[PDB]
Design a protein around this ligand. Structure first.
Ligand SMILES: OC[C@@]1(O)OC[C@@H](O)[C@@H](O)[C@@H]1O
Ligand SMILES: OC[C@@]1(O)OC[C@@H](O)[C@@H](O)[C@@H]1O
Ligand SMILES: OC[C@@]1(O)OC[C@@H](O)[C@@H](O)[C@@H]1O
Lengths: 90, 90, 90
C-alpha cells in the first residue's frame, strides 16, 4: 500500500537521485547541491533498484524496473536514457 | 508478509549499515569491524532506501522512509539524525 | 505480484551484479563488460538488498536476504559465498 524508493549518489557535493515506483509508474527526483527538482526519468515499473559509477567526471546510471516477472534496464550515459541489454529467465 | 532492507557501506574495513522496515518501524544495525550493534536510527516507515558518501573521513548518510505516497529524507552528518528537505508530488 | 531487485557495481568497466527475489528464491545476473550471465548466487529469500566495496582490486559483497522477520547475510570474499554474522531482534 506504500511507494518504494531506490537511491544512488556520487561526488562530494554530492549529487543524489531518488527513484520512486508508484502504481506502475517510476519517477525521479534529483539533487545537485542547489535544490531538489524532477528528473527526465519516467518509466513503467512496479519495483525499482539503482546503481551508479563515475568515469572521470562522467556519470553513468543503471535503473532496474520490474513489472511482474519481467525486468528492464535503463541506462543514462550523459545522452538521455536508453534501454539496456539486461535479461533474466524469471 | 516479509521485512524489507536497504544497505550501504563505506571504507575498506568496511563500515556497514543495514536498515530494516518492519510494520511501519525502521531500525538500523551497524558494523564497524568489531561486532554488530544497534544504531541510533528509529523512524516511521513502511519502506526504506539508502545512499552514502564520504567527505574526507566524514560519513554522510541519507535514508528515504516512505508510508503510503509520502516520502521523508533523514540526514546523518556526524551530529545526530536530522530531517532533510526532500519532496515529491506522488 | 512483482519481483524485487537490488543492484551494486564497482570499477569503471564496470562490473554489475543484479539480485532478484522471486517466490522466496534469489538469483543473480552478472556483467563484467562482455555479456550478461548468471552468477553462483542462489539463496532463499522474499526480499534482498546489497552493498559492495573494493579492497585494492578484490571485490567483497554482502547480500541481505529476508523471509518474514528473519534476515540473513551472505558474504562473497573471492572464495565462494559464505554465511555472515549479521543479527537482529525483529
Ligand atoms: O547499453 C548499455 C549497456 O551495455 O551497459 C552495460 C550493461 O548495463 C548493459 O546491460 C547495457 O545494455
Ligand atoms: O539537510 C541536509 C540536506 O540539505 O542535504 C542535501 C539533501 O539531501 C537535502 O534533501 C537535505 O535536506
Ligand atoms: O564473515 C564475514 C563478516 O564477518 O564480514 C563482516 C560483516 O559483514 C559480518 O556480518 C560478516 O559475518
Amino acid at each position: 500500500s506504500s511507494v518504494q524508493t531506490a537511491a544512488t549518489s556520487w561526488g562530494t557535493v554530492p549529487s543524489i537521485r531518488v527513484y520512486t515506483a508508484n502504481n506502475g509508474k517510476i519517477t525521479e527526483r534529483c539533487w545537485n547541491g542547489k535544490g531538489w527538482y524532477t528528473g527526465a526519468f519516467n518509466e513503467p515499473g512496479d519495483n525499482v533498484s539503482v546503481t551508479s559509477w563515475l568515469v572521470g567526471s562522467a556519470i553513468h546510471i543503471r535503473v532496474y524496473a520490474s513489472t511482474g516477472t519481467t525486468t528492464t534496464e535503463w541506462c543514462w550515459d550523459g545522452n538521455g536514457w536508453t534501454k539496456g541489454a539486461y535479461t533474466a529467465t524469471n
